[PDB]
Write a protein that binds this ligand. Structure first.
Ligand code: AUC
Ligand code: AUC
Ligand code: AUC
Ligand code: AUC
Length: 188
């Protein structure tokens, strides 16, 4: 029921608040941009006690922006959507119960040969507070979070939205997809 879910979500957010407080200003494991047998931005993501995951900005528009997000912070902002929204975030413990989760785990298993495209997310406002919502990529985000990936990239529609995401959940300034692609080519 509803009070049940609200109280659960409240307690998880409080947990996240503490964790973020403890780990404030400590170094996190970053995605690693890798050289690739294609013409795309690809990252190696370390996954604790698990084989590496690989993701790609292949399905991004040149106009999109990349934001590298603190997983815990991203998770907390997702919970801010509340519990009734169709995009409501399951508690981490229940994420593997999600219907598409096995299909996502399957995709993440392939590796560098078929990297998983990024999620497309947006900053929004819910009952007067900041939250994150999705255009796509909720399940793969759950996989990442349930597997405790510390930092991962996400896609945002435009500069201001990406700056807003980075402000609340980012570990770095946003960078435009077109400009990152260019730099990857000039360096990697
Ligand atoms: Au932060 C990266 N690549
Ligand atoms: N391609 C592709 Au996929 C998830 N989760
Ligand atoms: C964030 Au850069 C050349
Ligand atoms: Au071009 C970066 N970081």
């Amino acid at each position: 029921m509803l009070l049940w879910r609200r109280c659960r979500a409240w307690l998880e957010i409080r947990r996240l608040d503490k964790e973020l407080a403890q780990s404030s200003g400590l170094p996190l494991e970053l995605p690693q941009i890798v050289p690739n047998a294609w013409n795309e931005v690809v990252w190696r993501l370390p996954v604790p006690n698990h084989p590496d995951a690989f993701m790609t900005a292949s399905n991004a528009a040149q106009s999109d922006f990349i934001v590298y997000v603190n997983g815990l912070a991203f998770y907390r902002a997702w919970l801010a959507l509340g519990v009734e929204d169709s995009q409501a975030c399951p508690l981490k413990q229940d994420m593997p119960k999600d219907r598409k989760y096995p299909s996502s785990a399957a995709h993440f298993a392939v590796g560098i040969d078929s990297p998983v495209p990024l999620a497309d997310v947006s900053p929004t406002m819910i009952l007067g507070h900041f939250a994150v919502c999705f255009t796509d990529g909720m399940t793969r985000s759950m996989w990442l979070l349930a597997h405790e990936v510390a930092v991962f990239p996400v896609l945002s529609r435009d500069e201001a939205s990406a700056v807003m995401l980075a402000e609340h959940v980012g570990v770095a300034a946003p960078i435009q997809v077109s400009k990152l692609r260019e730099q990857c080519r000039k360096i990697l």
